[PDB]
Design goal:
Ferritin, part of a larger assembly, binds fe (ii) ion, mainly alpha, iron (chain C), 6 chains, 5 helices
């Protein structure tokens, strides 16, 4: 039971993209946390955890196919100062991810392999949901005003009592 | 046993510093309470209690060595009318405390003492966290605007543990 | 709606006296705790906390009338070695407190003000109770002696039961 | 409040080495779980999570000093097929980490810094404990024999 | 990993001192209980258990660093009759421990190892606390009087139900 | 009340032997725990605690007789690197202990003391039980083998 080499390379590329997503999301979460912004930090921390779960399932599937996952390669990492650059870079990486997912799902369904294809469209759906969230928040910050919007994520108003 | 005068005088100076910090922070919390701003008052109250604990432990340490803790003399306590200048004053007294503590801990580690060096380390860490929070707060208020930021604290607390 | 000066410096001076009292009481409690006299330390700590509540409410009232609280100045703080001198110092402090509080309460009661007078009889009642306790303690120490009283108060902090 | 270049660069190097260690531990854990050595898999997962928390505290400290942490560059990672070589790779990365750590702690204590010195002290202690575990396990495996140890570590109690 | 025998011999000295201290305190606790003196016996029991824990940490550290823990060497064990000389002997034992631990901590921190330095710091703090207790109780028994002091600890009852 | 010198000497020798056993058991327990043989370490700590309680009751009895216990002096302590040598060391120290116990029992019984006889009987029974356990482990290891015996006791939790 050996998979095709193109299947292995597609899984490896997706795994590399997931690792880059993990690193970028964690570094961002730390940046917003240091800036003091709380809700953004916790939401992106949850997003990073979800990406780690995706990496888990992908590496299990590729390991079952009798392959050697490569944990050495990593794509480029982008950092900015304001929230707009955060959202723009995240949108870019998710867009390239969706393109790769669509190509991979098409070819995988073409070349008689399904379970890998199934986890492919699962990751596809999750990432398209994340893109929708990112796009709607980008629109909201564009319309609302940067300072006025950021007045929302930060609040010290005794949240402990409940 | 009995301690050499250097450690005793450094501990007494530190005691004076934390007494000044306690008085300054309590007055800041009370004045913040009068102007209706709520959360800042409770945060500063917690800081005041932390400084009270620091003074208590330092007094215990100095009294262990058969010294004479001084409570007669204080430093110059200063007051502000708006948020910016009291934040600045807290930062100033904090920087002075950090520099003096670093010098004393170095010279007193050089003269055979660790336990009091350890308590100085603890005070250093707590004061460093306090100054980092102060600096982040100052940057946020300068970026966002005094009025808009002040709008975020006045009400809508709702402490209901039950 | 702000009050006249005479009331405000009366309150500010009373606050300074309270701050000196809390510092002296805390120092005495810490010393007696180190020496091994535990129950005395507990009582002195309770007294110090009550005096701190006094200071807090009194400065709240000072701020109420659009005042300018000052924390810079302090009265004299005295220290002792045996229980006798500590108790005597506390007695002198309390005597000055009651005298000055009475003069202040009457002088501003004669000037169409009530709430500050009210907090003043509250403080005065507390100080009268405290001076009563210190007086009876000193009298009992005189009646019995020194070593026996310490034997009564001293306890072994075993912390193993 | 800004820190010196030497301390921040030491922090960055340690963070990078630790991230590589996290990745390596996770990889070995997954391969151990694949072949049925479940107990080793649990142990490796616990160690990887501990390294994750250590990296989190390290990046918090470096970001405290108006630093710029890097998650881009990594060091080389190695993999193994049997227990002996993977254990040896673990031990050697631990040794290099502790050596760099001792040099850094001495330099920083000379350069008037305390909090970072304390956190490197804690990390040094934990890596000392972990290297002790690795060495004792390697010696036990050597004495006992590979087949018997593998028979010991097997679970085979999968519910379905 | 291997150790330079300086730290090994310092740890062995501390180990032997701890063992002899354990024996001394255990004997003194038994004797005070025989005299009917209860609370002193309980406190000595607790501090003897503390010293045993210290010895356990010491031997754990010496075994970790690839040492050979020697338990054959024992220092001098001395006894008394009244409370005064028992307290005095405890005081001098603590003083010797403080001095030896001081020399060891300085010389070994001058040798690029700090973990055993940290455990030495903890032990030093504990011993300073214990010697402070010894000094204060000796001073109070001197001032108060011996028989009147012993009247405070004696109690006439059956074996206390724990 | 006043005891006889010979029974006091026997009690002191017993106390010294118990202290030596405490030392050897604790050191052996730590050595075995450092190598991952968990269950043996746990049992050895249990035996050490038993020896401590035995030493404490012996101290109580010897102190009852208006005598002075001995703590400065202790017997020789022996350590090994494999399981067999420590097992034999425990066996031989227990053998010499049981011999001295029997002799002291006879002499002090002839010297009219009674409660000491009972406490020596209790310690005798416990030491005999420990000897039984040691011999059973020894011949089990001998017949079965070093490797498999070490394998069946490691935990790695
Ligand atoms: Fe994660
Ligand atoms: Fe994904
Ligand atoms: Fe402070
Ligand atoms: Fe308070
Ligand atoms: Fe008062
Ligand atoms: Fe690491
Ligand atoms: Fe014990
Ligand atoms: Fe100790
Ligand atoms: Fe025994």
């Amino acid at each position: 039971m050996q998979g095709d080499p193109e299947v292995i390379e597609f899984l490896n590329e997706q795994l590399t993209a997931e690792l880059t997503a993990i690193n970028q999301y964690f570094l961002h979460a730390k940046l917003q946390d240091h800036k003091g912004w709380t809700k953004l930090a916790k939401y992106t921390r949850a997003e990073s955890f979800d990406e780690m779960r995706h990496a888990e399932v992908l590496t299990d599937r590729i390991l079952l196919l009798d392959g050697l996952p490569n944990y050495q390669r990593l794509f480029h990492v982008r950092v900015g100062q304001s929230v707009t650059e955060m959202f723009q870079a995240d949108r870019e990486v998710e867009l390239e991810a969706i393109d790769r997912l669509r190509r991979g799902i098409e070819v995988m369904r073409a070349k008689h392999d399904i379970t890998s294809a199934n986890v492919f469209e699962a990751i596809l759906a999750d990432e398209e949901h994340h893109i929708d969230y990112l796009e709607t928040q980008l629109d909201l910050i564009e319309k609302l005003g940067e300072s006025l919007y950021l007045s929302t994520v930060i609040e010290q108003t005794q949240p402990d009592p409940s």
